[PDB]
């Protein structure tokens, strides 16, 4: 049994490499800046210190993961990308124009709130964007600016035509993309005659195959759904901290200031102590959840590094390892 | 005394490694108060007086 | 609730746009008031979000004002071993807050020094530099790094991009290997 | 039946409003799609221009537990026309009306043994003067021992006789004619909160709500805050002394003329119990969509 | 299945779906694993494979 | 009972994530050295597979 017709199937995959780096000042959140509260917090002592240790260690380990992945993925030699790249194949939607157009559409179609990197203080003076300080917790920016990711993706896109022509990564073979895809499609069991006589039809098939996914960003995309799920996971992880101040843990009020201005001192000591216990339990559970998410992110980052090192810079022969059908 | 004192006491040592560390955020002082909502009617104390 | 004498101390328009401790007749807290369009039921006079936090208030004097919080500066520090050097960063905020309105313990002194604006906020304790570092050991945020010396100072450099070895592409039948 | 998704009869939160959010909230509501407790008001017998002996139901003989208050929708009829209730052969335009509620904590039998006699202080909500008057009082009633009178012979029920030909003239309004009708059957003493409520009259359906808490007896209405909508709102807190156990209504009839009998709207009554509802608070703070849990 | 309160959900695929899938794989593994490229199927007798 | 249920939810999520990752490994094994003859030493079979 032998096929007659064929198409270029497009497969979209998402790998979450690193969750959002978050830290929180312990006694600032738990105590909310009251002096007798702070005196009633000092007997616990090192609890805030050890949760700061855990968050700092997780953040530094995720920094190491990001640096390792973005250093291993960097190609040794690449080629500049200009308009007119790829010859007859219209892959100009992946051309940078900086950020790529597909990344622009992807970031447009997903709900993202920037955490006020310029004037979030002013965005609370006169405008989650403002709730980051209402309870009080920092949102760290990623390890590298967007231009670094743009440079990495541009270099890898300029080198993807050239790395995969000969085994061994010492040489570089920055061929025009037409002869690249001709040899890559020849190596998977296609005679050279049919590709030598039918460049135009396979080129048009390639063009419509790449253009099919431009409008494909909807619920039907598995990878888009995973992107939305990861962003929603970050949002609900932040909202768990942002919503626990409403809980009283059996207290009569959600405000420490209302307690200190409302009650008899010996009973409000017990009320504040139960508030301390509940908030510290919530922070400990959040520490454990952050550690679990960090472990999952590190393992997925390792898998992503392996996947981009195997079937991106070279044509993998493993059946369906990273793409259905013959990759 | 200072933030480095708290950072030293957070690690329970006189020696810590280099890097970026989150420290206790301070708070700006309040500038005053506002006390106004719907009142202006006096409670009844005439049979008490 | 009781009453006091006012003149012009407890007016919303008087203390507009500043951090004040509001005590609105059984609603006590701190925050910053701001002029907003009228949203919600007028007679209830208290609008809340899904987290039971007061969003705004219908003034007897005027109308609805918003209030969010008494927002202040979150502080991070950078400190180097074997060289007793440290600097302070205030994230996501312009170089607009100075040593006047403090809280908590105290703050340290550097030397006597302009507050450097940066994409990660406002930093005290650093100096500008037209230098590029590809092997940064103190990842400050975005593409910014701190560089020590070998009693020196602390420098702010940009985390550069290791540009790969460029090769030219041919439109002819030959090839540039 | 009440459609909560259609936002019909849902008590607002008493002190705090919201905006443009879908929020779960623990409040006091009726069950979904209850068919109500229909009582209708119909005019009495009339021959030409002579209002004859009245024509009322057996509402007074039945009593119900107050529980957690109740809501009443008014003008569930809405601008319409329909057959005259006393005379089915004739149809007239339906005009809205407000009901009178008798509210107490002790039951007993009347002079003839008819159940419905109430001891001690009772709260009466009597509408008066073409609906513009909303008298309400937690005061003391005594029966009268005359003909067709509650402590006397030939007595079946007490109601309100209303002559709109003399009352609903332009101005005047007969100077609480229905309270004098109330005094025609009872004697009144030891009074508490006489309360007057000037309102206007229209033909738009609205809502009234009654309950009691530690503050006292709480009265809610749409009228003052939401005329053109249908949302429900606090307006009064009357300082009652005692918790309310039992309630009934006062039948109402109209001394109209025979050739100009007018149709009257029938209200609906729904009991209140604590539930948890998901409410879609709009931008303006009004409620236009809500769903249940139970 | 009821007395504690939990409900054990039924499996997503039938036993017959499992049998059909395993039969398809056992048929395919005789032929696929001789020449690479998954476009063509090569149902050689098992001994020669 | 609520604490017991929460612990059950936590261990259920942990076991489900572990089973999903192991199923991904199973998919890799079944399209690696089942539909084709591998040369990897001891990846899915002791001795020469
Ligand atoms: C029996 O007879 C009376 C007598 O006229 C009728 O009264 C009319 O009632 C309708 C229904 O409200 C009035 O129509 C107008 O509808 C507008 C639409 O409002 C939208 O937005 C609100 C707010 O979210 C929603 O609640 C609503 O459902 C709609 O989605 C309103 O904006 C109107 O209010 C404005 O009215 C006039 C102009 O119409 C202005 O002068 C006012 O200031 C106000 O801004 C109003 O609600 C209609 O106006 C009423 N007539 C008169 C003469 O007032 C009864 O409706 C009728 N019963 C029926 C028909 O069933
Ligand atoms: C190459 O692909 C790009 C990406 O789709 C094309 O740009 C858009 O093409 C659609 C129709 O294919 C037009 O409706 C849009 O107006 C185009 N965008 C812009 C900014 O012009 C582009 O036309 C394709 N080029 C070729 C030669 O096929
Ligand atoms: C009330 O909340 C809804 C729900 O998000 C808001 O509706 C969104 O409005 C924006 C701006 O027009 C649209 O881009 C979204 O698609 C809308 N969402 C949905 C689900 O329709 C609405 O704007 C809010 N109202 C106000 C005044 O902020
Ligand atoms: C807020 O100020 C209004 C004056 O005009 C406003 O100007 C700026 C401040 C914007 O808020 C803009 O939307 C307005 O047009 C007053 O009309 C309004 O009553 C003020 N609000 C109050 C007093 O609550
Ligand atoms: C530190 O220097 C950076 C370098 O940017 C370039 O040089 C300065 C003098 C400006 O001309 C700027 O527009 C140039 O792009 C500045 O980006 C940065 O703002 C400088 N820091 C401060 C606090 O000004
Ligand atoms: C292949 O499929 C395309 C569309 O799917 C069709 O237009 C074309 O005629 C087909 N060619 C053959 C040889 O089947
Ligand atoms: C309440 O009614 C009962 C029965 O008539 C009577 O005995 C009692 O004195 C009354 N109490 C008051 C306070 O009116
Ligand atoms: C108030 O109640 C008492 C007890 O029933 C009664 O004696 C008295 O006459 C009442 N007062 C009036 C004004 O009727
Ligand atoms: C009700 O209306 C009449 C008519 O003008 C007026 O005299 C009276 O004061 C009003 N009462 C209230 C309580 O508004």
Automatic annotation (TrEMBL), chain A:
Residues 199-249 are annotated as: Heptad repeat 1. Residues 175-280 form the Coronavirus spike (S) glycoprotein S2 subunit heptad repeat 1 (HR1) region profile domain. Disulfide bonds join 26-48, 31-37, 124-130, 311-322. Residues 100-121 are annotated as: Fusion peptide 1. Glycans are attached at residues 5, 90. The record marks 99-100 as: Cleavage. Residues 228-272 form a coiled coil. This is Spike protein S2. The gene is S.
TrEMBL record, chain D:
It is found in: Virion membrane; Host endoplasmic reticulum-Golgi intermediate compartment membrane; Host cell membrane. Residues 1-294 form the BetaCoV S1-NTD domain. It comes from the Viruses. Disulfide bonds join 130-168, 139-191. Specific enzymatic cleavages in vivo yield mature proteins. The precursor is processed into S1 and S2 by host cell furin or another cellular protease to yield the mature S1 and S2 proteins. Additionally, a second cleavage leads to the release of a fusion peptide after viral attachment to host cell receptor. The cytoplasmic Cys-rich domain is palmitoylated. Spike glycoprotein is digested within host endosomes. Signal peptide: none annotated. Glycans are attached at residues 20, 58, 109, 120, 176, 190, 198. Homotrimer; each monomer consists of a S1 and a S2 subunit. The resulting peplomers protrude from the virus surface as spikes. Spike protein S1: attaches the virion to the cell membrane by interacting with host receptor, initiating the infection. Spike protein S2': Acts as a viral fusion peptide which is unmasked following S2 cleavage occurring upon virus endocytosis. Fusion peptide 1 (FP1) and fusion peptide 2 (FP2) function cooperatively and have a membrane-ordering effect on lipid headgroups and shallow hydrophobic regions of target bilayers. They are considered as two domains of an extended, bipartite FP. The membrane-ordering activity is calcium-dependent and also dependent on correct folding, which is maintained by an internal disulfide bond in FP2. Belongs to the betacoronaviruses spike protein family. This is Spike glycoprotein. It comes from Human betacoronavirus 2c (isolate EMC/2012) (HCoV-EMC). The chain holds residues 47 to 340 of 1353 of the full protein.
């Amino acid at each position: 049994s032998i096929p007659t017709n064929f198409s270029f199937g497009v497969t979209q995959e998402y790998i979450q490499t690193t969750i959002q780096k978050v830290t929180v000042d312990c006694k600032q959140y738990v105590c909310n800046g009251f002096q007798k509260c702070e005196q009633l917090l000092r007997e616990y002592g090192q609890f805030c210190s050890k949760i700061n240790q855990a968050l700092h260690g997780a953040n530094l380990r995720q920094d190491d993961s990001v640096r390792n992945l973005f250093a291993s993925v960097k190609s040794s030699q690449s080629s500049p990308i200009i308009p007119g790249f790829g010859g007859d194949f219209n892959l100009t939607l992946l051309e940078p124009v900086a950020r790529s157009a597909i990344e622009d559409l992807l970031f447009d179609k997903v709900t993202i709130a920037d955490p006020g990197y310029m004037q979030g203080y002013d965005d609370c003076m006169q405008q989650l964007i403002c709730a980051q300080y209402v309870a009080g917790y920092k949102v760290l920016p990623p390890l590298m600016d967007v231009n670094m990711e743009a440079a990495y993706t541009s270099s890898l896109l300029g080198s993807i035509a050239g790395v995969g022509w000969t085994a061994g990564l010492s040489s570089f073979a920055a061929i025009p993309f037409a002869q690249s895809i001709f040899y890559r499609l020849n190596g998977v069991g296609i005679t050279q005659q049919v590709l030598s006589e039918n460049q135009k039809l396979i080129a048009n098939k390639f063009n419509q195959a790449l253009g099919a996914m431009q409008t494909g960003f909807t619920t039907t995309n598995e990878a888009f759904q995973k992107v939305q799920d990861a962003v929603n996971n970050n949002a609900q992880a932040l909202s768990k901290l942002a919503s626990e101040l409403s809980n009283t843990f059996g207290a009569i009020s959600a405000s420490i200031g209302d307690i200190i201005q409302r009650l008899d001192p010996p009973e409000q000591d017990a009320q504040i102590d139960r508030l301390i216990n509940g908030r510290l339990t919530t922070l400990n559970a959040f520490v454990a959840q952050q550690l679990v998410r960090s472990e999952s992110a590190a393992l997925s980052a390792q898998l992503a590094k392996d996947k981009v090192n195997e079937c991106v810079k070279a044509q993998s022969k493993r059946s369906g390892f990273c793409g259905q059908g013959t990759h | 005394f200072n933030d480095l004192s708290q950072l030293h006491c957070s690690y329970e040592s006189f020696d810590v490694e280099s890097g970026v560390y989150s420290v206790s955020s301070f708070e700006a002082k309040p500038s005053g108060s506002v006390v106004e909502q719907a009142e202006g009617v006096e409670c009844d104390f005439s049979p008490l007086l | 609730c009781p009453k006091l004498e006012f003149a012009n101390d407890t007016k919303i328009a008087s203390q507009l746009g500043n951090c004040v401790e509001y005590s609105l007749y059984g609603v006590s807290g701190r925050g910053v008031f701001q002029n907003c369009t009228a949203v919600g039921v007028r007679q209830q006079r208290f609008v809340y979000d899904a987290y039971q936090n007061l969003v705004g208030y219908y003034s007897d004097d005027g109308n609805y004002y918003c209030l969010r919080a008494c927002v202040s500066v979150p502080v991070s520090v950078i400190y180097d071993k074997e060289t007793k050097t440290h600097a302070t960063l205030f994230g996501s905020v312009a170089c607009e807050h100075i040593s006047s309105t403090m809280s908590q313990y105290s703050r340290s002194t550097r030397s006597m020094y302009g507050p450097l604006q940066t994409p990660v906020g406002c930093v005290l304790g650093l100096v500008n530099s037209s230098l590029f570092v590809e092997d940064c050991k103190l990842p400050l945020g975005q593409s910014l790094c701190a560089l020590p010396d070998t009693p020196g100072e602390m420098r702010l450099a940009s985390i550069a991009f290791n540009h790969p070895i460029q090769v030219d592409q041919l439109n002819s039948s030959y090839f540039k290997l | 039946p009440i459609d909560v998704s259609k936002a019909d009869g849902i008590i607002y939160p008493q002190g705090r409003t919201y905006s443009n959010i879908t929020i779960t909230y623990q409040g006091l509501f009726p069950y979904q799609g209850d068919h109500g407790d229909m009582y209708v008001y119909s005019a009495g017998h009339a021959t030409g221009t002579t209002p004859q002996k009245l024509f009322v139901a057996n509402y007074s003989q039945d009593v119900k537990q107050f529980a957690n208050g109740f809501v009443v929708r008014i003008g569930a009829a809405a601008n319409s026309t329909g057959t005259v209730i006393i005379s089915p052969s004739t149809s007239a335009t339906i005009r809205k009306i407000y009901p009178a509620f008798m509210l107490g904590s002790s039951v007993g039998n009347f002079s003839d043994g008819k159940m419905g006699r109430f001891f001690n202080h009772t709260l009466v909500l009597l509408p008066d003067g073409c609906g513009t008057l909303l008298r309400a009082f937690y005061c003391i009633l005594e029966p009268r021992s005359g003909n067709h009178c509650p402590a006397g012979n030939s007595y079946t029920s007490f109601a309100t006789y209303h002559t709109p030909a003399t009352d609903c003239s332009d101005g005047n309004y007969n100077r609480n004619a229905s309270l004098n009708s109330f005094k025609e059957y009872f004697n009144l003493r030891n009074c508490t909160f006489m309360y007057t409520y000037n309102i206007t009259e229209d033909e738009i359906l609205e809502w009234f709500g009654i309950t009691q808490t530690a503050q006292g007896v709480h009265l809610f209405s749409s009228r003052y805050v939401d005329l053109y909508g249908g949302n429900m709102f606090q307006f009064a807190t009357l300082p009652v002394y005692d918790t309310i156990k039992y309630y009934s209504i006062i039948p109402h009839s109209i001394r109209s003329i025979q050739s100009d009998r007018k149709a009257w709207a029938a209200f609906y009554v729904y009991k209140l119990q604590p539930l948890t509802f998901l409410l879609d608070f709009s931008v303006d703070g009004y409620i236009r969509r809500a769903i249940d849990c139970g």
